[PDB]
Amino acid sequence: REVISIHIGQAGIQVGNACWELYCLEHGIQPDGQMPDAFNTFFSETGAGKHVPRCIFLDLEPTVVDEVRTGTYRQLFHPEQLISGKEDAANNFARGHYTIGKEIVDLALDRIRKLADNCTGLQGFLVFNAVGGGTGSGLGSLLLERLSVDYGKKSKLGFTVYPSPQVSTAVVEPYNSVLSTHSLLEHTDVAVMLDNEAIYDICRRSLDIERPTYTNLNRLIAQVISSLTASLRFDGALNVDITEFQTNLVPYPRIHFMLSSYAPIISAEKAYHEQLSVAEITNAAFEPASMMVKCDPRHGKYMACCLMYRGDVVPKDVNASVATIKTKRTIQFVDWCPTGFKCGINYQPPTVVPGGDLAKVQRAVCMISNSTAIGEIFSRLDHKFDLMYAKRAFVHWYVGEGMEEGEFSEAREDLAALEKDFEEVGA
Amino acid sequence: REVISIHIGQAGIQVGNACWELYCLEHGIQPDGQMPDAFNTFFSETGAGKHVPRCIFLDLEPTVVDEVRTGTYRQLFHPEQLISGKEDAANNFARGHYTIGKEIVDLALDRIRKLADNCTGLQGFLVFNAVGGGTGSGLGSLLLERLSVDYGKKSKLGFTVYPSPQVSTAVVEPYNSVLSTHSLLEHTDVAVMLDNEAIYDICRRSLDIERPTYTNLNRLIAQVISSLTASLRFDGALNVDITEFQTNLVPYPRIHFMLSSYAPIISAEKAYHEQLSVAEITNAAFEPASMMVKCDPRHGKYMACCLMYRGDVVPKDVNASVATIKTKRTIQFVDWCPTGFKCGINYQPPTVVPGGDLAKVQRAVCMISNSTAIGEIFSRLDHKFDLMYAKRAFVHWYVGEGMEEGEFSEAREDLAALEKDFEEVGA
Amino acid sequence: YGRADGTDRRVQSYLWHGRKQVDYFVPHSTGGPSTLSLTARKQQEWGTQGATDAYLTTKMAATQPAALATAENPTRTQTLRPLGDSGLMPQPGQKPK
Amino acid sequence: IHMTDGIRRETMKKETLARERSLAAQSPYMAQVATYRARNPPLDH
Amino acid sequence: MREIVHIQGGQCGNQIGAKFWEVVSDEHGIDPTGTYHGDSDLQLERINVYFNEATGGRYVPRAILMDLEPGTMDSVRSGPYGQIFRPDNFVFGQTGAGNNWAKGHYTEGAELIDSVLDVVRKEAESCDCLQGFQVCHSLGGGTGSGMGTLLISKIREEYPDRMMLTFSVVPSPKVSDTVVEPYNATLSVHQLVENADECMVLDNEALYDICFRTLKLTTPTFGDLNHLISAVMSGITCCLRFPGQLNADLRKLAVNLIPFPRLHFFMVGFTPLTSRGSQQYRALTVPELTQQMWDAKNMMCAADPRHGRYLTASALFRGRMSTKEVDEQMLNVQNKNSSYFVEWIPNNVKSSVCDIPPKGLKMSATFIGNSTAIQEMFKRVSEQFTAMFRRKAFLHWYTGEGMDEMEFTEAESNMNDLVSEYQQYQ
Amino acid sequence: EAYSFLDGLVLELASRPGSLSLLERKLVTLENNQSLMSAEDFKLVLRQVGSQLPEDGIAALLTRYAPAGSRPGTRLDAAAFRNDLRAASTAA
Ligand SMILES: Nc1nc2c(ncn2[C@@H]2O[C@H](COP(=O)(O)OP(=O)(O)OP(=O)(O)O)[C@@H](O)[C@H]2O)c(=O)[nH]1
Ligand SMILES: Nc1nc2c(ncn2[C@@H]2O[C@H](COP(=O)(O)OP(=O)(O)OP(=O)(O)O)[C@@H](O)[C@H]2O)c(=O)[nH]1
Ligand SMILES: Nc1nc2c(ncn2[C@@H]2O[C@H](COP(=O)(O)OP(=O)(O)O)[C@@H](O)[C@H]2O)c(=O)[nH]1
Ligand SMILES: [Mg+2]
Ligand SMILES: [Mg+2]
């Protein structure tokens, strides 16, 4: 059982630069690439005495990829895997979707199969991208399209980064996010949302780092990814693989958007004082103060839930805590889901990165639920998309790249149809 | 069986500062938080080799709180169990009840909920505050009110620091004291008064300390608190729980005000001097020279008494001593309570702190009684409230914070009603 | 409360009295790391402010100390299995390979 | 259910602790039993 | 002589089978290396019912372990008494169903069941006179429920006259792991009522209950639950393995507990169950076994019998016991609460005695009560299945595979008429 | 005295025999475009190969094999150090 991870965009490969740091530290791999079977789902045993990841970074600006080439992991990544174009898309869906992709995407999917061929029991692909950017949105959608044509039946997990409501780093990211999500609807199998204000609030509130950079963000995002692939890598009492998501978390094939959460996000000193038990971390993973997306599930109704447990946990107390939640009435499950939970238990405790801020913990929880607060997210983003589009601002950029207003209108109404869908199910 | 303790105001957390030093000494817990089941009611065990108290210090001025945070008890207290605002309430009930209380009380109420959940056999709450100030009175009464609407049935043992008649460290303390008690009536179930002039006279008379400070007061107050929770902590021949003050000492829903007393208050050399037995300490616990609140029980009539005994005490002699008291006609009881005594016996003798002025004693007694001289106290304070209120002195401060004249008038007449009630029950 | 002075005699001994009998032994200053921890911290901070390298990108400045620190004492956190309250031992449900 | 769960743990701890305390207490009590038994000599028929 | 071949499906089936074979090997004294080391010659005469002599006293179990994920397989090989199974009997897929009954029943069965049928047919035709098949599996997962269901169907169409047990665990709303529990449980039960000979219903909720109340353990891991279900399975097939004063084979139990060919869902209890602290302060009499066996909080199902009627019942005993006390205690419990037993059948209690106790014990017992309280459990599942299927939750994962709507309708229909007939005989 | 440290290092790597040929693989791969390695990189490589040498000893090796015109301990000449290490390897 093997899984390969592809990273699209400048945020993608920074997420990768944290995930693969965590994987190597988890399996005791030196940054040179070799140890001084459980790893087989990520690293291949090259040649002799050398483990090379199952990953492809790809980007259009050469700056950040070449920084990876000169970073600490110079030899830990195969030279051919880190693809890189000559000029970026520059915050432009059209420029990233019609001009430069037609050259780089053919080489990229020619190199992913040269990876899937080495694989034998491929569990699925999983993608990392920020839809706000240019190459993350456009080329990302172009790659996802040709992936669906080439493989189709294999699962394509997605961890995307939407623009935050009020904190934002761009202006045309509404246009980019919308024109990206029209393909993100019907091409990815499972899609997990990751906003940045939510992560900023977590690192400010819980970990009380007053000045966090993106590194700390990437660190705990890698904690989330590691915790939901740990069932493949290590062994537990009740394991769930990558196929279980598309079974137990998506009640209707067009509804795959899942809020994530993590607990306990605790610093070095608060570890000594809080007696970490399963009950209170199962509570802690449910407050809006500890979610990975700035939304409120109080406004929404949980359509399903998944609970990944790592460390010193027995099925007894996790079943006890999940009972208390099911009986509490502060949060409300949907009527059509009688058993809106799915638990998964793993024994390997989550490791720490020295220099990181989390402490050595005995047990952790990674919650992935499906709700209707996401239907609130898309509407709040649609509102400010039509705000700009009413004056046709920035449109000349895309039409200059060669596109038209047709996909503007059809992406707008496609989002409208999705809001109608979310309000329906949530009945 | 567990009990949690909250400390409000500048006086509250200086008292708990003594109280928690004593608890660490009694159960042999080092000030770094570990031992080198009787502690279970105060110190919870975290992980391996740690103990973290069930308490919250809170104050709006961070000065004395972070003095605790930089003391020796840094590792012992949970980092977030020391709540601290940003700016003082400044001897102002309205300022400490509406302006800053509204933002500090929600954080304290969530924290207390966490402590309760980490508790299992919760006996009740016990609070420590001074009503002369603003922080202790204002958001004290606010927190007491919100604790009543949250739990209600759980007993709230309130040890409040009332002002002395002539010795006083403030000016608007009558306005604050009346506004505090006005809600302390219907929210505290069992309220024990603690004055300051009375303890000054005690520390001058028996411990013959000629220039006492607050630390002496707090240390022997801590000795009293530990003496009345010793029955919950340790096994005794006849132990009483925190629920029986509620029953054996409160004859009416609005007569809950007690005079506390403690004996033997003896220094080091006078321990060698004096032959301590149960008859004389039972006698010594009744004259007003050993009461913790400046009033004369000779002017009043007793309603109900309770006596904790610690150490080498047999029920025989204590019965003989109380028999000699009831047949003594210097003090007189009310006609509606012929059996007005309550006894409780715990085995462990009270421990001493290094540097304290209390000597190692074989046996001790803590008396908590009810009388009507308290009705004399409230009148003595009420008269000096009217003297300022007639001229509308200092009122512009309170109405500027947001209150009006109605609260002054209604609190004045409510203490008038309580005056009439003590006069009626005294008949 | 912290008992800063070595010999814990009495609460009122530290207060200033009129009498030389006690005024001789009132302590003036409590010298120790228990006090100087804050200046230790902030002096470390002022030192790292004063001595800085200009050409240290953040991305790589974060990783290098980590890669060194784990290399110093390499321990691989082995799978801990919660001991069930019985003579039976867990024998987990899955095993990787 | 958290209360009902912690109740079990506290009861178990206090049960085994009582076993320890009573095992310790038994030997001096048996000693006093032996002492006052020595006083009474049985008769010879 | 009479042969019992074993079948395990899924992760639950593999781990239960692991503890079951650990206990049986303990009973017959065979070491974890595979050689006999016992003392009494009673253990040699009836190991052909479970094992096959290889050479020099190597007895390998007659079991077929079936699953879809190597995690179960490696966990089997790693534990003690793991090196005694033959690797040929580890028929084992590679993709994995993963909580999808359709994958477990239509897509993965097509390429797995041919290999399992090869192994099991070789294992059956190897011994002479099959008593019957044994199946332990789960109704929550896919490869346990789905593949196990397909294997049950193919077996009952191949070897029709032989007996067949099925120990199935049913997921409860209190202890609820997965989301598609009803979509799996209802379809499996819809097949078990026409194909399986008799079914004995376990439930993890009741097992956690019992390990809290009776055993008084603090951390009841799955090992203890597998230990309880193993004690049940051993107590069931004890009479074939050891001579008694009153023998009782599986077919004898079936004919004495199944009055109607569609009423074959039993409930199970086990006794004695006492905590190790309360292990000194107990007596060991047949009254002390019966008062705990007939207790409602001792059943291994989530069905309170005091909410229904005992249609029939049975009690198997182990240990050198007095038949007079056995029969008079059965009579007393039968005549005291005369309202909990059906009327049109007198003498509702089948009894049996075997003279070999389980190791470490003097006297034990096992109970199988064919009650009409089991339709409480089936309603408790069918109401959730209606809650979903009224509204096509998750339906696309089953429709896009080959399964269609009418399978769900007929599954609902057979669920409803089964609870209807159980309700009729109440 | 850095030569004594180099001799102690080759004697340390004489044991765990895979660890010698592993180190020359490190100096070639973790090299710069020019044959220069950072002080942090050199210390990391020694620790990763599992050789423990006193930090003062590491400084001595760096000073002996330092690149010309650099600060005293900032960098290290990987090619010179490796060609010098091969000699002690074949001599031991
Ligand atoms: N959460 C998170 N977001 C990031 C990170 N790095 C960049 N982003 C987000 O990426 C979004 C824009 O895409 P970028 O990655 O910056 O650039 P791009 O995707 O390559 O698109 P182009 O600039 O046109 O090439 C912004 O909204 C950033 O918030 C990161 O490390 N963590
Ligand atoms: N017995 C005793 N009383 C104290 C102590 N500290 C303060 N007090 C009393 O507290 C009263 C005034 O309230 P403070 O505690 O000073 O301040 P506060 O109640 O927190 O109100 P703010 O000043 O607004 O924060 C004074 O009359 C003191 O008598 C103490 O350590 N022991
Ligand atoms: N008694 C018992 N129940 C188990 C065990 N493992 C899993 N279960 C239960 O079985 C259900 C999941 O079944 P699963 O193992 O996934 O079936 P499979 O996927 O076909 O192998 C969960 O509700 C678990 O509670 C076990 O070892 N013993
Ligand atoms: Mg970019
Ligand atoms: Mg104050």
PDB file of all heavy atoms in Angstrom, chain C residues 4 6 8 15 19 21 24 28 30 38 45 50 57 61 64 67 69 71-73 80 82 86-87 90 92:
ATOM      1  N   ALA C   4      13.340  33.869  50.566  1.00  0.00           N
ATOM      2  CA  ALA C   4      14.549  34.274  49.859  1.00  0.00           C
ATOM      3  C   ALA C   4      15.759  34.254  50.777  1.00  0.00           C
ATOM      4  O   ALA C   4      16.818  33.735  50.407  1.00  0.00           O
ATOM      5  CB  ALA C   4      14.366  35.661  49.252  1.00  0.00           C
ATOM      6  N   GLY C   6      18.124  32.847  53.566  1.00  0.00           N
ATOM      7  CA  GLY C   6      18.389  31.443  53.834  1.00  0.00           C
ATOM      8  C   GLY C   6      17.733  30.944  55.107  1.00  0.00           C
ATOM      9  O   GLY C   6      17.123  29.873  55.123  1.00  0.00           O
ATOM     10  N   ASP C   8      14.935  31.030  57.756  1.00  0.00           N
ATOM     11  CA  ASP C   8      13.540  31.443  57.868  1.00  0.00           C
ATOM     12  C   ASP C   8      13.188  31.639  59.336  1.00  0.00           C
ATOM     13  O   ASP C   8      12.734  30.714  60.011  1.00  0.00           O
ATOM     14  CB  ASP C   8      12.654  30.406  57.196  1.00  0.00           C
ATOM     15  CG  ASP C   8      12.945  29.009  57.679  1.00  0.00           C
ATOM     16  OD1 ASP C   8      13.834  28.864  58.539  1.00  0.00           O
ATOM     17  OD2 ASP C   8      12.317  28.058  57.176  1.00  0.00           O
ATOM     18  N   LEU C  15      10.598  43.217  58.784  1.00  0.00           N
ATOM     19  CA  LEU C  15      10.102  44.579  58.814  1.00  0.00           C
ATOM     20  C   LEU C  15      11.059  45.480  59.583  1.00  0.00           C
ATOM     21  O   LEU C  15      11.816  45.037  60.446  1.00  0.00           O
ATOM     22  CB  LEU C  15       8.717  44.628  59.448  1.00  0.00           C
ATOM     23  CG  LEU C  15       7.672  43.837  58.671  1.00  0.00           C
ATOM     24  CD1 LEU C  15       6.327  43.907  59.360  1.00  0.00           C
ATOM     25  CD2 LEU C  15       7.580  44.358  57.259  1.00  0.00           C
ATOM     26  N   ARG C  19      14.077  49.411  66.835  1.00  0.00           N
ATOM     27  CA  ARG C  19      15.123  48.859  67.680  1.00  0.00           C
ATOM     28  C   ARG C  19      16.248  48.238  66.864  1.00  0.00           C
ATOM     29  O   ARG C  19      16.027  47.494  65.903  1.00  0.00           O
ATOM     30  CB  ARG C  19      14.542  47.813  68.625  1.00  0.00           C
ATOM     31  CG  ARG C  19      13.403  48.329  69.468  1.00  0.00           C
ATOM     32  CD  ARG C  19      12.860  47.235  70.352  1.00  0.00           C
ATOM     33  NE  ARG C  19      12.444  46.080  69.568  1.00  0.00           N
ATOM     34  CZ  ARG C  19      12.994  44.877  69.672  1.00  0.00           C
ATOM     35  NH1 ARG C  19      13.986  44.673  70.527  1.00  0.00           N
ATOM     36  NH2 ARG C  19      12.556  43.877  68.921  1.00  0.00           N
ATOM     37  N   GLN C  21      18.008  45.936  68.000  1.00  0.00           N
ATOM     38  CA  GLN C  21      18.026  44.510  68.302  1.00  0.00           C
ATOM     39  C   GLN C  21      17.659  43.696  67.075  1.00  0.00           C
ATOM     40  O   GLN C  21      18.250  42.642  66.816  1.00  0.00           O
ATOM     41  CB  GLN C  21      17.063  44.199  69.443  1.00  0.00           C
ATOM     42  CG  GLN C  21      17.703  44.215  70.801  1.00  0.00           C
ATOM     43  CD  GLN C  21      18.340  45.547  71.108  1.00  0.00           C
ATOM     44  OE1 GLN C  21      17.649  46.540  71.331  1.00  0.00           O
ATOM     45  NE2 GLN C  21      19.664  45.581  71.114  1.00  0.00           N
ATOM     46  N   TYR C  24      19.526  45.231  62.882  1.00  0.00           N
ATOM     47  CA  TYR C  24      20.776  44.728  62.329  1.00  0.00           C
ATOM     48  C   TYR C  24      20.530  43.613  61.330  1.00  0.00           C
ATOM     49  O   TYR C  24      21.223  43.514  60.313  1.00  0.00           O
ATOM     50  CB  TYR C  24      21.683  44.226  63.446  1.00  0.00           C
ATOM     51  CG  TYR C  24      22.556  45.288  64.043  1.00  0.00           C
ATOM     52  CD1 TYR C  24      22.385  45.688  65.353  1.00  0.00           C
ATOM     53  CD2 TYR C  24      23.561  45.883  63.300  1.00  0.00           C
ATOM     54  CE1 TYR C  24      23.181  46.653  65.906  1.00  0.00           C
ATOM     55  CE2 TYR C  24      24.362  46.852  63.844  1.00  0.00           C
ATOM     56  CZ  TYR C  24      24.167  47.231  65.149  1.00  0.00           C
ATOM     57  OH  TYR C  24      24.966  48.198  65.700  1.00  0.00           O
ATOM     58  N   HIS C  28      18.583  43.377  53.166  1.00  0.00           N
ATOM     59  CA  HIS C  28      18.397  44.449  52.200  1.00  0.00           C
ATOM     60  C   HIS C  28      18.192  43.951  50.781  1.00  0.00           C
ATOM     61  O   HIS C  28      17.325  44.463  50.072  1.00  0.00           O
ATOM     62  CB  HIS C  28      19.597  45.392  52.227  1.00  0.00           C
ATOM     63  CG  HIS C  28      19.918  45.914  53.587  1.00  0.00           C
ATOM     64  ND1 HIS C  28      19.275  47.001  54.135  1.00  0.00           N
ATOM     65  CD2 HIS C  28      20.806  45.493  54.516  1.00  0.00           C
ATOM     66  CE1 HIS C  28      19.756  47.231  55.343  1.00  0.00           C
ATOM     67  NE2 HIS C  28      20.687  46.330  55.598  1.00  0.00           N
ATOM     68  N   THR C  30      18.228  40.393  48.029  1.00  0.00           N
ATOM     69  CA  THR C  30      18.185  38.948  47.845  1.00  0.00           C
ATOM     70  C   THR C  30      18.819  38.631  46.496  1.00  0.00           C
ATOM     71  O   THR C  30      18.178  38.766  45.451  1.00  0.00           O
ATOM     72  CB  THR C  30      16.752  38.444  47.923  1.00  0.00           C
ATOM     73  OG1 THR C  30      16.080  38.736  46.692  1.00  0.00           O
ATOM     74  CG2 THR C  30      16.022  39.140  49.057  1.00  0.00           C
ATOM     75  N   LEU C  38      15.086  36.886  34.839  1.00  0.00           N
ATOM     76  CA  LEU C  38      14.541  37.768  33.814  1.00  0.00           C
ATOM     77  C   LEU C  38      15.649  38.487  33.060  1.00  0.00           C
ATOM     78  O   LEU C  38      15.605  38.581  31.829  1.00  0.00           O
ATOM     79  CB  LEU C  38      13.577  38.769  34.440  1.00  0.00           C
ATOM     80  CG  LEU C  38      12.656  39.485  33.454  1.00  0.00           C
ATOM     81  CD1 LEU C  38      11.340  39.799  34.127  1.00  0.00           C
ATOM     82  CD2 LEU C  38      13.286  40.755  32.921  1.00  0.00           C
ATOM     83  N   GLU C  45      18.439  37.801  24.859  1.00  0.00           N
ATOM     84  CA  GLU C  45      17.732  38.438  23.752  1.00  0.00           C
ATOM     85  C   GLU C  45      18.509  39.624  23.193  1.00  0.00           C
ATOM     86  O   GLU C  45      18.590  39.802  21.974  1.00  0.00           O
ATOM     87  CB  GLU C  45      16.340  38.874  24.201  1.00  0.00           C
ATOM     88  CG  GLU C  45      15.513  39.574  23.130  1.00  0.00           C
ATOM     89  CD  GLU C  45      15.621  38.942  21.753  1.00  0.00           C
ATOM     90  OE1 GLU C  45      15.714  37.700  21.655  1.00  0.00           O
ATOM     91  OE2 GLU C  45      15.617  39.695  20.757  1.00  0.00           O
ATOM     92  N   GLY C  50      22.054  41.894  19.025  1.00  0.00           N
ATOM     93  CA  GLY C  50      23.296  42.533  18.632  1.00  0.00           C
ATOM     94  C   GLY C  50      24.061  41.737  17.595  1.00  0.00           C
ATOM     95  O   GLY C  50      24.561  42.294  16.616  1.00  0.00           O
ATOM     96  N   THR C  57      18.020  33.152   5.237  1.00  0.00           N
ATOM     97  CA  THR C  57      16.614  33.026   4.892  1.00  0.00           C
ATOM     98  C   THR C  57      15.889  32.279   5.998  1.00  0.00           C
ATOM     99  O   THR C  57      16.469  31.432   6.673  1.00  0.00           O
ATOM    100  CB  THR C  57      16.452  32.293   3.567  1.00  0.00           C
ATOM    101  OG1 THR C  57      15.061  32.066   3.320  1.00  0.00           O
ATOM    102  CG2 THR C  57      17.175  30.964   3.608  1.00  0.00           C
ATOM    103  N   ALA C  61      16.783  28.857   7.835  1.00  0.00           N
ATOM    104  CA  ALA C  61      17.225  29.149   9.190  1.00  0.00           C
ATOM    105  C   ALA C  61      16.462  28.313  10.200  1.00  0.00           C
ATOM    106  O   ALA C  61      16.967  28.035  11.291  1.00  0.00           O
ATOM    107  CB  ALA C  61      17.043  30.631   9.491  1.00  0.00           C
ATOM    108  N   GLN C  64      17.946  24.051   9.691  1.00  0.00           N
ATOM    109  CA  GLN C  64      19.305  23.673  10.067  1.00  0.00           C
ATOM    110  C   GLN C  64      19.457  23.323  11.544  1.00  0.00           C
ATOM    111  O   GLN C  64      19.997  22.239  11.838  1.00  0.00           O
ATOM    112  CB  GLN C  64      20.265  24.797   9.667  1.00  0.00           C
ATOM    113  CG  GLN C  64      21.707  24.449   9.856  1.00  0.00           C
ATOM    114  CD  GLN C  64      22.131  23.344   8.932  1.00  0.00           C
ATOM    115  OE1 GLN C  64      21.798  23.350   7.749  1.00  0.00           O
ATOM    116  NE2 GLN C  64      22.856  22.374   9.465  1.00  0.00           N
ATOM    117  N   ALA C  67      17.755  19.885  12.094  1.00  0.00           N
ATOM    118  CA  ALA C  67      18.489  18.756  11.539  1.00  0.00           C
ATOM    119  C   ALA C  67      19.730  18.459  12.360  1.00  0.00           C
ATOM    120  O   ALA C  67      20.158  17.303  12.454  1.00  0.00           O
ATOM    121  CB  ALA C  67      18.860  19.031  10.085  1.00  0.00           C
ATOM    122  N   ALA C  69      19.863  19.128  15.715  1.00  0.00           N
ATOM    123  CA  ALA C  69      19.441  18.744  17.052  1.00  0.00           C
ATOM    124  C   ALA C  69      18.997  17.295  17.092  1.00  0.00           C
ATOM    125  O   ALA C  69      19.293  16.576  18.050  1.00  0.00           O
ATOM    126  CB  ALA C  69      18.321  19.664  17.529  1.00  0.00           C
ATOM    127  N   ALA C  71      20.088  15.054  15.040  1.00  0.00           N
ATOM    128  CA  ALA C  71      21.286  14.267  14.786  1.00  0.00           C
ATOM    129  C   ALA C  71      22.088  14.067  16.060  1.00  0.00           C
ATOM    130  O   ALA C  71      22.786  13.058  16.212  1.00  0.00           O
ATOM    131  CB  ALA C  71      22.140  14.944  13.718  1.00  0.00           C
ATOM    132  N   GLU C  72      22.013  15.028  16.981  1.00  0.00           N
ATOM    133  CA  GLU C  72      22.816  14.941  18.199  1.00  0.00           C
ATOM    134  C   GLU C  72      22.476  13.696  19.012  1.00  0.00           C
ATOM    135  O   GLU C  72      23.368  12.922  19.375  1.00  0.00           O
ATOM    136  CB  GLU C  72      22.642  16.203  19.042  1.00  0.00           C
ATOM    137  CG  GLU C  72      23.858  16.557  19.898  1.00  0.00           C
ATOM    138  CD  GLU C  72      25.139  16.767  19.097  1.00  0.00           C
ATOM    139  OE1 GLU C  72      25.075  16.901  17.858  1.00  0.00           O
ATOM    140  OE2 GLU C  72      26.222  16.824  19.719  1.00  0.00           O
ATOM    141  N   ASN C  73      21.198  13.485  19.320  1.00  0.00           N
ATOM    142  CA  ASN C  73      20.751  12.297  20.049  1.00  0.00           C
ATOM    143  C   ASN C  73      19.608  11.650  19.283  1.00  0.00           C
ATOM    144  O   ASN C  73      18.429  11.907  19.557  1.00  0.00           O
ATOM    145  CB  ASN C  73      20.336  12.638  21.479  1.00  0.00           C
ATOM    146  CG  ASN C  73      19.421  13.832  21.548  1.00  0.00           C
ATOM    147  OD1 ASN C  73      19.086  14.428  20.527  1.00  0.00           O
ATOM    148  ND2 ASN C  73      19.003  14.187  22.755  1.00  0.00           N
ATOM    149  N   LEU C  80       4.295   2.732  21.343  1.00  0.00           N
ATOM    150  CA  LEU C  80       3.887   2.404  22.700  1.00  0.00           C
ATOM    151  C   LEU C  80       2.497   1.785  22.673  1.00  0.00           C
ATOM    152  O   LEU C  80       1.589   2.304  22.016  1.00  0.00           O
ATOM    153  CB  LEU C  80       3.922   3.640  23.603  1.00  0.00           C
ATOM    154  CG  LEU C  80       3.072   4.881  23.327  1.00  0.00           C
ATOM    155  CD1 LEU C  80       1.682   4.765  23.931  1.00  0.00           C
ATOM    156  CD2 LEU C  80       3.780   6.114  23.863  1.00  0.00           C
ATOM    157  N   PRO C  82      -0.691   0.609  24.980  1.00  0.00           N
ATOM    158  CA  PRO C  82      -1.277   0.744  26.318  1.00  0.00           C
ATOM    159  C   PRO C  82      -1.538  -0.620  26.933  1.00  0.00           C
ATOM    160  O   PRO C  82      -2.206  -1.469  26.340  1.00  0.00           O
ATOM    161  CB  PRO C  82      -2.581   1.506  26.062  1.00  0.00           C
ATOM    162  CG  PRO C  82      -2.881   1.260  24.624  1.00  0.00           C
ATOM    163  CD  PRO C  82      -1.558   1.177  23.939  1.00  0.00           C
ATOM    164  N   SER C  86      -5.179  -6.291  32.638  1.00  0.00           N
ATOM    165  CA  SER C  86      -5.379  -7.734  32.702  1.00  0.00           C
ATOM    166  C   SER C  86      -4.023  -8.402  32.543  1.00  0.00           C
ATOM    167  O   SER C  86      -3.019  -7.751  32.245  1.00  0.00           O
ATOM    168  CB  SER C  86      -6.345  -8.236  31.622  1.00  0.00           C
ATOM    169  OG  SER C  86      -7.530  -7.461  31.554  1.00  0.00           O
ATOM    170  N   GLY C  87      -4.009  -9.720  32.743  1.00  0.00           N
ATOM    171  CA  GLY C  87      -2.853 -10.499  32.343  1.00  0.00           C
ATOM    172  C   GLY C  87      -2.658 -10.541  30.845  1.00  0.00           C
ATOM    173  O   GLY C  87      -1.533 -10.752  30.381  1.00  0.00           O
ATOM    174  N   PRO C  90      -1.925  -6.357  24.720  1.00  0.00           N
ATOM    175  CA  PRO C  90      -2.832  -5.911  23.644  1.00  0.00           C
ATOM    176  C   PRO C  90      -2.803  -6.758  22.384  1.00  0.00           C
ATOM    177  O   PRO C  90      -3.867  -7.183  21.917  1.00  0.00           O
ATOM    178  CB  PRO C  90      -2.360  -4.478  23.374  1.00  0.00           C
ATOM    179  CG  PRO C  90      -0.953  -4.466  23.794  1.00  0.00           C
ATOM    180  CD  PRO C  90      -0.897  -5.341  24.999  1.00  0.00           C
ATOM    181  N   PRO C  92      -1.841  -5.828  19.017  1.00  0.00           N
ATOM    182  CA  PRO C  92      -2.671  -4.893  18.244  1.00  0.00           C
ATOM    183  C   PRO C  92      -3.313  -5.532  17.023  1.00  0.00           C
ATOM    184  O   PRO C  92      -2.968  -6.630  16.586  1.00  0.00           O
ATOM    185  CB  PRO C  92      -1.675  -3.806  17.836  1.00  0.00           C
ATOM    186  CG  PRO C  92      -0.359  -4.487  17.846  1.00  0.00           C
ATOM    187  CD  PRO C  92      -0.422  -5.448  18.991  1.00  0.00           C
TER     188      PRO C  92
END
